[PDB]
């Protein structure tokens, strides 16, 4: 009987081989890099291709359902517009270029007069990031962010690098005037990848200078 | 043959159909309607279509392939 | 200055970016923005229009500004953005 | 064999998928006849399109998203309305699950606001049995920071309805017509998403003469009063329009179907301070006994937000220390710094 | 005093195409959008004739003309002039009736009070001891 | 070439931006060498 | 295409009459079926006449070299071949069953309520058209009546919206009455 099981194994092995060869010869290249907007239930997703055209898919294609999530950047066929392979993100390379670790060391000795503001930032961050156990125990929710408003030349960028300097962290700087790209869906992808990268790394701070570029 | 010709004439109004705005009339059985695709085409006009509904703003329907006022 | 304001969106920022990149590639480069008021008007919110396009070009220029030396000339310096006139860029 | 069986069935589903082709997402804009539609692609031209036989004609109303075949150009199936955080208005903001007990010492004012707004939205049967059109709009006036916005969020949370918060001083823009245009867009927005709590901030900018800029405030005021009470749809949305100076408000802005019921919310009441400290300091871990009367007497003329800053700053003092709140001296210095440094 | 409510009743009782616009809706920014909106309103009344245009609170954009010294008053005077042209101009609109409601009746431009543009200047006074009885009876 | 995938360091499956047309995942022609195409540099692709 | 050109060349290697045909499913959406056969013409035959045909008369028949295909290369790299479809009996007869009705069809009485509604609607439209006909005929304006009959041609009142409508209503009425009488005769 073991020979019968072996024969079934070999037959289904060559069946797997032929279906795999069909899949491989239907994969080929190129793929249309498309961004899945959402996933409707009634195994079918609404894709917006990089060609600025949306195409509903009756079936998802050569991928598995729960792996796909709203916002996933995948590669689809140029004609049938069907998901072929999920494309890894890797946070591009520009996003990883903004984790700058040559912090010019704005020690609080290099910033004068902005003392109470330094202490207010260190009350809003640092201790929430460093000594967080007591912060959970108290029930004081630490504000996730601070907005540095002030007349130009006040030193907002300086104190930002300062509290990025003497308080460790990764300092993923995400300055606003950078976050405007004539390519559609690049700035938004930049922000989402920056936050995903901040999730990936150790305790860090996302810093956005001149928010008016996108904050209008 | 005449009922046949009328039948294929009606068939040209099948329902793959783009819509364009009737910009201007040139002369009988032709037009300059610009399609919604983004281009303006010098087209032909069906005889069955009455010319008095061809006001110079009408959102007329065009053949998908031949791109003619149908 | 006229070229740094293009019809298509984002082309002015790209223009200034490659201008600064070419300037950096050269050794001891000088840039002279004659009539800065064309691309240096005071910032205000005008999203429903093309004004923010040259606005974002100016913001990208400020980002580039803050061996390279930069020159700017204007007969109405009161119309320039205070951020651009601060002594970190000029 | 079994694992091979499962993955081979999945691979055959993939093989069938490879033959399957995509559909252009489109939106129906008109229905000429019972087999004719005007469907516009998301980014594309408009096509005269028919419907598949296994599809209900009625469901394809103007505005119904569809996914037509991209070769025959025929509708194959309907799609529900597209969802995305692309909304330009405050509706997507959630007021937060805050109860009426969270705001302390406004029991009478809370009750009047419930009677004015909660009743027409929850049980209109009383109002229709009496024979009166349900009241719409309540005006909360008081010192700034006293908690009118918190009250609005509490109502919007209990009623489980969408909530719009707007700074009325922001809506008056220098350019002509945008001030009234913002109110217009706000109201037409509330028409689509119902029921709606239209909480407007300090109205004295909008509500209450020989220059164009002054007649602009008149024009936006008329637009507002037309939006609340008048033509089109009398609607069911409610407004929690709150002000800081009630005498400035236009008398026409105070009418029954036009934002009646001037609720006075004065600075936290003498007994209300204790309740506010209980609700906003109780969450803070503190084993030590409290002399609340002493804090209340040391906090005279305080506003509701000040007590929350006292609690947060006492927590901060604890952060700069052991970690546990044990002593009243902390509440004293917190009150003083929320007294002198918040001036 | 029932100015808006009578127009509402007319709209509920008309076989024509009622087109309500508020006076504040014509005051749009981007000069050339308000007068263009007036042009669109009257044109829309034109194809779907017979049609009725109810312009409530016209005192916003139909105040007496004067020597405007900025684009601000120039644009509102332009809206008023476009109203005058479309209500009675070189293009006589037929089967297009206009109801217009104001609370002042004296700031209105004299050209707009002409008996060729606004023929009937109906006055809605405060209810007397007789009308108040009827209003109470109908509401109650 | 905005990104290099490097699926197995032998079939890199480069991602290319065609400016206005679209963004695609493509491979080299046999003529050009794998090491000549470095990230971010301008590349020339065929129409097909 | 050029790739199609090479593909046809490879097919011609096995046999020098390996035809290549193209079928466009979208243009052939109706009675017209756009299908043109092609065979590669040898690039070494430029010395002699392209389309090397001989005594015949069917070169211009059944088609005229299309503009849509001429610019992509016709009579230069590949030449079209006249298309002819072998359809015979016992095959067409099976195909006519696509829309053939049945014995039940032709005896149904339609629906009398909507039949009366349609008859009344057509009669009313005939009444308006007869008012128009009366106006036009009684006008009988004689300032060049031959030019009057050609300055008012827009598919209107005189005859096109005349008896053609009488044609349809009379056809419907006679068919319905004949079917009704046939049923009263056959069915008891
Ligand atoms: N409080 C301060 N102490 C020391 N140096 C300061 C201080 N404030 C500003 N500076 C200096 O002045 C300059 C201001 O640049 P910086 O970008 O830090 O300020 P900013 O207010 O954030 O600027 P901008 O708003 O134009 O982006 C820097 O060279 C900085 O070193
Ligand atoms: N009466 C109150 N009871 C409890 N908390 C209050 C009260 N008043 C204000 N607060 C606190 O102050 C914060 C902001 O108050 P806000 O609603 O902005 O006051 P206002 O509406 O008067 O401006 C709220 O988050 C709330 O926690
Ligand atoms: N004759 C009336 N009968 C009943 N209600 C009336 C009468 N006149 C005015 N009203 C009430 O006055 C309110 C204001 O409406 P109206 O006077 O038409 O608008 P406006 O104040 O702009 O003239 C309405 O809600 C209406 O119920
Ligand atoms: Mg800065
Ligand atoms: Mg009114
Ligand atoms: Zn081909």
CSV table of C-alpha atoms in Angstrom, one decimal, chain F:
chain,number,residue,atom,x,y,z
F,1,UNK,CA,15.1,53.1,-10.9
F,2,UNK,CA,13.5,54.2,-7.7
F,3,UNK,CA,14.2,50.9,-5.9
F,4,UNK,CA,16.0,47.6,-6.3
F,5,UNK,CA,14.1,44.6,-4.9
F,6,UNK,CA,17.0,42.1,-5.0
F,7,UNK,CA,14.6,39.1,-4.6
F,8,UNK,CA,17.5,36.6,-4.5
F,9,UNK,CA,20.5,38.8,-5.5
F,10,UNK,CA,20.2,37.0,-8.9
F,11,UNK,CA,16.8,38.2,-10.2
F,12,UNK,CA,16.8,41.7,-8.7
F,13,UNK,CA,13.4,42.7,-10.1
F,14,UNK,CA,14.1,46.4,-10.3
F,15,UNK,CA,11.3,49.0,-9.9
F,16,UNK,CA,11.3,51.8,-12.4
F,17,UNK,CA,9.5,55.2,-12.6
F,18,UNK,CA,8.6,56.2,-16.2
F,19,UNK,CA,7.8,59.7,-15.0
F,20,UNK,CA,4.3,60.3,-16.3
F,21,UNK,CA,3.3,56.8,-17.6
F,22,UNK,CA,3.5,54.7,-14.4
F,23,UNK,CA,5.7,52.8,-12.0
F,24,UNK,CA,6.7,49.2,-12.9
F,25,UNK,CA,8.6,46.2,-11.6
F,26,UNK,CA,10.9,45.2,-14.5
F,27,UNK,CA,14.1,43.2,-15.2
F,28,UNK,CA,17.2,43.8,-17.2
F,29,UNK,CA,17.7,42.9,-20.9
F,30,UNK,CA,20.5,40.4,-21.4
F,31,UNK,CA,22.7,43.1,-23.0
F,32,UNK,CA,23.3,45.2,-19.8
F,33,UNK,CA,25.1,44.0,-16.7
F,34,UNK,CA,23.4,43.7,-13.3
F,35,UNK,CA,26.0,45.8,-11.5
F,36,UNK,CA,25.8,48.8,-13.9
F,37,UNK,CA,22.3,49.8,-12.6
F,38,UNK,CA,22.5,51.4,-9.2
F,39,UNK,CA,19.6,52.8,-7.2
F,40,UNK,CA,18.2,56.2,-8.3
F,41,UNK,CA,20.2,56.5,-11.5
F,42,UNK,CA,18.4,57.2,-14.8
F,43,UNK,CA,17.7,54.0,-16.8
F,44,UNK,CA,16.5,53.4,-20.4
F,45,UNK,CA,13.7,51.0,-20.9
F,46,UNK,CA,12.0,49.6,-24.0
F,47,UNK,CA,8.5,50.4,-25.1
F,48,UNK,CA,7.2,46.8,-24.9
